[PDB]
Design a protein around this nucleic acid. Structure first.
Lengths: 94, 101, 79, 91, 78, 95, 103, 91
DNA sequence: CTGGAGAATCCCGGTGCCGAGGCCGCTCAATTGGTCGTAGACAGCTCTAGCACCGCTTAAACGCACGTACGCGCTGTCCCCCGCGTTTTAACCGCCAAGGGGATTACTCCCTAGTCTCCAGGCACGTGTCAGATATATACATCCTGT
DNA sequence: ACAGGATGTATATATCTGACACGTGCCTGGAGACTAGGGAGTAATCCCCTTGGCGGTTAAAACGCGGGGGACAGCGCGTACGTGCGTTTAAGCGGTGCTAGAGCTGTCTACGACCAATTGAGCGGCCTCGGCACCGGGATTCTCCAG
């Protein structure tokens, strides 16, 4: 057996089949999308950590993630991402 | 599962574990991983939808790095987000200056 | 050194990729100089990363991190 | 000057790498020989280095072409590259 | 708008501080446009930082962090 | 009358490169900053140090932009900078 | 009770730097050798910048360091300029630079 | 509010006995020290994270210094750090 | 400018490859249920510092005259790179073989987290003044116009 | 190219001045001693993959010979931008006055770290076959040049 590297390939494939019913995706494109997701996640987590450090709060809540999303993603992407996150949290807490 | 509750397709639990293990903060809220997973899902859906449209414009049914490069560079806000990013084996946008012709 | 091994038609094709209609005869030297400088920076960072881990084999992750240092993030090679 | 435009279209339409693999590998190993002796490179590492170098050179040549067109010329010259590096802050 | 308050001689002195020797008549509009874009970006980031902290008073540290985001770090303000 | 070939331009260049104080008028710049911040969040109050920091950043950015524009304009064998010079300097920087 | 700064021979707060490393959560554990090394590096950088600024001040026949002198010290030395290429210094002015063709 | 003002003043009196430092210059030096320390700590955190080790030792700081500071600054800083750690261990 | 005409181009169809998509173990991580400690939500207080107005000075913006320098178009020339045919070089594919080094496992143990004690270095705050600016009083280097 | 004059630029003095160096008080986090527990270090072992080699093609770089277009210097004219100079006009200074929210403290609860038990979601491997890279072959479009 060999040690495994945890990646988002399954979830990216699920999303692709959700938006485009028939279009597949090659290995290189999947790797590019996985690296893109990892980089965006790292940027958002880093900005949330800096925002928590600046105000001395040790906790990362949905509010820090929302502020980090507004900081990093520009314009309409930020607005849509904030709306999606708010909808997800609202559905989750119920 | 939390992903089933929130309706997301992304691994909320895995993102929470990444936030905890990365030591980004000493504590993590219960709502933060859900929000982060929703944002990641939205971004991935946007880029994959644009890439799929580009692929269908090229009479193909398998996304390739060229299609993702075209989708990223043609869209404005994504290009602004990925200004410095280099996509391997992605080629360049077709661009010939007016004075050259 | 071996930097002269980069053939002139390769530089011509690279320039044509960028949308250039004519190339002066002296471009083929400045291009080699700039390429060597960039490679020297990236290889220096990657070799430092590799020496930190004590390995003697420079992996793809080291080069990807080195590029990410210079604000030239590379997708499609993991990380 | 038509073959220049034909090559521009053909190479902007393509995706594969343009730098010769073996000479570039020799160059990379020679450069790394100075920092740390007796190194062994993974093939994927050399591929990533080659892709980064190609992308950087293409970007530099795009900016150089912009500078050369700005001066009401078409033949890019070393002063164009030097200016494009100076403005970018890389020098 | 209030952008017109930036008079011509101010831009002339700024350019002279940058080494320029002669200035065309059409530069002035472009300089105001670029200044407005830069200020808009920095102030938007500062306002996001402030709204995060539940304050209505944009402080010097918020502007310093907003600049540090753009890779234009400012020293001498904490 | 007197010397008018452009000597005073060089004299101003020397004088303003030697100086260090702020150049942009403080009150109009404060008005501009408040107007810009009006859109993003209504009824904002700025600490004076924040306005001073914004002014310093704007001055440094404009000085750098004009240095690059001067390089571009001299590159084209001209002396007088023109809007296309600024547009090129911004396009190359990749802001 | 000799402080760790006295043991290392430095002048910078080794203990304070260790506290900053631990509190910032940069890593789960912080070695005992890290704060001393970090204090030494910071002290060397501060000494270099202050030495260059003081030389600039003595060049202008001023006995008090001011932001203009620090700006001159940073922008003259090549390596420090490379380290601080994008850094803006308040009230520091710019370097005197007039192009040849403009004279 | 904790800053490096006292230690910076001690270093300045160590290098230039007869030269003082104004408040603005002291604030600039304090911000510079904070920024350099933040850069080094962040790079060491990334180095520890990549190799999965949870400990920051002198080796991580040395590699971070070599990655951040350029050229002769890096070499001299590494020499100073090694000298200080060597003196500290034996005393 | 206007039609051959040749080279490059795309459109269509057949071939064969091999990488994408699915299914089978199974493992370790996601989840549930408590338990406990505390960071944070919320209310309340104090007063620092930001906003607004008013009157006076005058530094600096603004409008205008003007003339000179510099931008821009046009011309002529030569040189240097593009196109292309040919020869020579070595990149590259395909296979083989070695062994150096990366990836785990196991044990030991040395070092660092956590805790209690103690107090002195570090920060806030009164204090004096000495190194900073400032305007008048000459001395000196530099550009303009004419010779 | 030289010289006289007008003009910024610099040197030297008293004259004031508040930012900085200095001294005093209080406190919390740094240093020390103790404990334990697990990450680091060292050694061993396996085998995976990277370097080196060989050999034959054969893609393709190197070289070279036209020649054409375009880089560059030169020429001129046109106009607009820099430099005064008189005339506003708000910036800047201070002083007052009000109060919004910065900043802090104090409770007390809802929320997250943390322990274990449980089990299935995801990951590797192992497959199969259809989308696509490729290759002719023919129809279509573009560049070029004699007419």
């Amino acid at each position: 057996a060999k040690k495994s590297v945890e990646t988002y390939k399954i979830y990216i494939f699920k999303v692709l089949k959700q938006v485009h019913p028939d279009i597949g995706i090659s290995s290189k494109a999947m790797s590019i999308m996985n690296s893109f997701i990892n980089d965006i996640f790292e940027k958002l987590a880093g900005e949330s950590a800096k925002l928590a450090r600046y105000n001395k709060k040790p906790t990362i809540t949905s509010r820090e993630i929302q502020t980090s999303v507004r900081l990093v993603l520009p314009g309409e992407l930020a607005k849509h991402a904030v709306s999606e996150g708010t909808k997800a949290v609202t559905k989750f807490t119920s | 599962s939390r992903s089933s509750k929130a309706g997301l397709q992304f691994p909320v639990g895995r993102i929470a574990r990444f936030l905890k293990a990365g030591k980004y903060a000493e504590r993590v809220g219960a709502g933060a991983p859900v929000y982060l997973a929703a944002v990641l899902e939205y971004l991935a859906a946007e880029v994959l939808e644009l890439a799929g449209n580009a692929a269908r414009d090229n009479k193909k049914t398998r996304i390739v790095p060229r299609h993702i490069q075209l989708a990223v560079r043609n869209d404005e806000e994504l290009s602004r987000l990925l200004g410095t990013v280099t996509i391997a084996s992605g080629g360049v946008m077709p661009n010939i200056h007016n004075l050259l012709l | 050194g071996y930097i002269q091994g980069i053939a002139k038609p390769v530089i011509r094709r690279l320039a044509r990729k960028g949308g250039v209609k004519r190339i002066s005869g002296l471009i083929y030297k400045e291009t080699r100089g700039v390429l060597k400088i960039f490679l020297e920076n990236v290889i220096r960072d990657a070799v430092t990363y590799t020496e930190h881990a004590r390995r003697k084999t420079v992996t793809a992750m080291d080069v990807v991190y080195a590029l990410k240092r210079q604000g030239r993030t590379l997708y499609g090679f993991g990380g | 000057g038509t073959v220049a435009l034909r090559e521009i279209r053909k190479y902007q339409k393509s995706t594969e790498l343009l730098i010769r693999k073996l000479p570039f590998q020799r160059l990379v190993r020679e450069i790394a020989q100075d920092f740390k002796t007796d190194l062994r490179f993974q093939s994927s590492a050399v591929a990533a280095l080659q892709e980064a170098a190609e992308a950087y050179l293409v970007g530099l040549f795009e900016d150089t072409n912009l500078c050369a067109i700005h001066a009401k010329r078409v033949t890019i010259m070393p002063k164009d590259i030097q200016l494009a590096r100076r403005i970018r802050g890389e020098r």
